Chains A and B, each alone.
With several copies, the nearest count.
Chain A
Amino acid sequence: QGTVNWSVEDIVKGINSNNLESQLQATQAARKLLSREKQPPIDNIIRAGLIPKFVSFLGKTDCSPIQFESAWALTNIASGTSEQTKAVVDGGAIPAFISLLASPHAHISEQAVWALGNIAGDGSAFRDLVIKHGAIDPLLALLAVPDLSTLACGYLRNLTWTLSNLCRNKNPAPPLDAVEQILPTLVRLLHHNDPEVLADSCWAISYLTDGPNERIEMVVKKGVVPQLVKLLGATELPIVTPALRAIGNIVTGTDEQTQKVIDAGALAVFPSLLTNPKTNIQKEATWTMSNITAGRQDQIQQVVNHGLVPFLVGVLSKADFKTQKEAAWAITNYTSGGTVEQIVYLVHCGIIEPLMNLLSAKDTKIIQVILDAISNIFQAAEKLGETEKLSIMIEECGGLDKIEALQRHENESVYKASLNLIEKYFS
């Protein structure tokens, strides 16, 4: 009735009055433009000079309503482009929002957490500035209760989201000492039964395990892999997605880190992941399988044992093309590091036909990966005195018509590997 749909000039007139109630009503008016318009005029607000007036309102402890309205307006400006977030930061907002974390009003401390999450969420430099101003200690103090379930749901969701933005981004990664302060609380949110807190917790763990193997070790050492694998089997796709990403990041690390996810039973979920209706899940699960078949021979054997090779044959036969490209990598790694027996098993599962169908792809990376696999399969045929059998299989399915052509190919790596498979086998 009163503060609905003012113009910016009226907002300025109100904020500039020497009347705290008039400042209050024009702030609430600004907040409603910024929360109720799709396409809010963030830029006009900034150009009017209002950010530093809102930042000074954060400090009016005497008037908790204008604290809230300005905290809400600043949250929404900081949710915009990086130039918009920067205007909020340049206005002095970080330390003001950090003091508001101590507020006795929950709705105000919650809004301060939400604003700091938008600021941290902009990128590495603002993430690291928030840490430097000391946000971590009072953020974690807000979770220092015996049972998390006594906290309001939206409140705990906002905190988890902000903590996860403090773990996010990678040129550079968050300081080690920040990560070590945050990890124990993150392990605890990972056992909290609310799907949105579990989702954002797994995203946090996924950001922290992307990077060098030393970062992975610090997560894996906290003992979280079995809880991650349990979230991997959830029915909520927004949980399964970052749980899979975090697991996938872990198998890019050392053979010992890889074995922790095998030991926790991750491979039993892969039948469902590899046939998942959501193509992004299939893509990532196949990426993750490709890093497992880059493992040791005894890790290759566990993929075999769990019945997964037929699934990789299936995904190479019929998947979205980027999923097939990952299955191609999984095959090359398996054939480059597997025993001869493992490799015979692969051929017995029907690998040859779909491997050959992919040689008609117009993408040069995959063609090299596949020729690489052919040559590894042949080497194990060499070791067996069965190169005869193998060439017939390839000729019999259309392999030879395809490999011939790649002699006449506009890429050095391609025509060399193929004109050589011909010169050595076809013959």
Chain B
Amino acid sequence: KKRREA
């Protein structure tokens, strides 16, 4: 569910 930085 978590989203890492571009």
Q: How far is the CB of A255 from chain B (nearest CB, A)?
A: 10
Q: Does A201 lie at the interface of the complex (its beta carbon under 8 Å from any beta carbon of B)? A: no
Please classify the interface of chain B as helix (H, G, I), strand (E, B), loop, or mixed, using the class held by over half of its residues: loop
The interface size of chain A toward B, counting residues with CB under 8 Å, comes to: 31
Q: Does A368 lie at the interface of the complex (its beta carbon under 8 Å from any beta carbon of B)? A: no
Shortest Cβ distance from A119 into B: residue: B1
Choice from A72, A85, A245, A291 contacting B2 with Cβ under 8 Å: A291
Mask of B1-6 contacts with A, CB within 8 angstroms, 1/0: 111111
Q: How far is the CB of B1 from chain A (nearest CB, A)?
A: 4
Q: How far is the CB of B4 from chain A (nearest CB, A)?
A: 5
Q: Are B1 and A252 in contact (CB under 8 A)?
A: no
Q: Are B2 and A117 in contact (CB under 8 A)?
A: yes
Determine the chain A residues whose CB is within 8 A of the CB of B1 once the complex forms.
Answer: 78-80, 85, 118, 121-122, 294, 333, 336-337
Shortest Cβ distance from A290 into B: residue: B3
Determine the chain B residues whose CB is within 8 A of the CB of A121 once the complex forms.
Answer: 1
Q: How far is the CB of A157 from chain B (nearest CB, A)?
A: 10
Q: Are B6 and A79 in contact (CB under 8 A)?
A: no
Q: Are A245 and B4 in contact (CB under 8 A)?
A: no
Q: Are B2 and A35 in contact (CB under 8 A)?
A: no
Q: Are A291 and B3 in contact (CB under 8 A)?
A: yes
In the bound complex, how far is the Cα of B1 from the Cα of A78, in angstroms?
Answer: 8
Q: Does A23 lie at the interface of the complex (its beta carbon under 8 Å from any beta carbon of B)? A: no
Shortest Cβ distance from B3 into A: residue: A79
Determine the chain A residues whose CB is within 8 A of the CB of B5 once the complex forms.
Answer: 35-36, 210, 245, 248-249, 252, 287
In the bound complex, how far is the Cα of B1 from the Cα of A85, in angstroms?
Answer: 10
In the bound complex, how far is the Cα of B4 from the Cα of A251, in angstroms?
Answer: 9
Shortest Cβ distance from A213 into B: residue: B2
Q: Does A378 lie at the interface of the complex (its beta carbon under 8 Å from any beta carbon of B)? A: no
In the bound complex, how far is the Cα of B4 from the Cα of A253, in angstroms?
Answer: 9
In the bound complex, how far is the Cα of B2 from the Cα of A85, in angstroms?
Answer: 12
In the bound complex, how far is the Cα of B3 from the Cα of A85, in angstroms?
Answer: 12
In the bound complex, how far is the Cα of B1 from the Cα of A122, in angstroms?
Answer: 7
In the bound complex, how far is the Cα of B3 from the Cα of A80, in angstroms?
Answer: 8
Q: Are B2 and A118 in contact (CB under 8 A)?
A: yes
Shortest Cβ distance from A82 into B: residue: B1
Determine the chain B residues whose CB is within 8 A of the CB of A85 once the complex forms.
Answer: 1
Q: Are A76 and B3 in contact (CB under 8 A)?
A: yes
Q: How far is the CB of A152 from chain B (nearest CB, A)?
A: 16
Q: Does A329 lie at the interface of the complex (its beta carbon under 8 Å from any beta carbon of B)? A: yes
In the bound complex, how far is the Cα of B6 from the Cα of A336, in angstroms?
Answer: 23
Determine the chain A residues whose CB is within 8 A of the CB of B6 once the complex forms.
Answer: 35-36
In the bound complex, how far is the Cα of B1 from the Cα of A337, in angstroms?
Answer: 9
Determine the chain B residues whose CB is within 8 A of the CB of A249 once the complex forms.
Answer: 4-5
Determine the chain B residues whose CB is within 8 A of the CB of A333 once the complex forms.
Answer: 1
In the bound complex, how far is the Cα of B5 from the Cα of A253, in angstroms?
Answer: 12
Q: Does A75 lie at the interface of the complex (its beta carbon under 8 Å from any beta carbon of B)? A: yes
In the bound complex, how far is the Cα of B4 from the Cα of A322, in angstroms?
Answer: 16
Q: Does A203 lie at the interface of the complex (its beta carbon under 8 Å from any beta carbon of B)? A: no
In the bound complex, how far is the Cα of B5 from the Cα of A291, in angstroms?
Answer: 11
In the complex, besides A248-B5, A249-B5, 4 extra interface pairs with C-beta distance below 8 angstroms are A36-B5, A117-B2, A329-B3, A336-B1
Selected A-B contacts with CB under 8 Å, 12 pairs: A35-B4, A75-B3, A76-B3, A79-B3, A80-B1, A121-B1, A122-B1, A210-B4, A249-B5, A287-B3, A291-B3, A336-B1
Residues of B within 8 A of A (CB): 1-6
Top 3 closest pairs, chain A to chain B, by CB = A294-B1, A79-B3, A79-B1
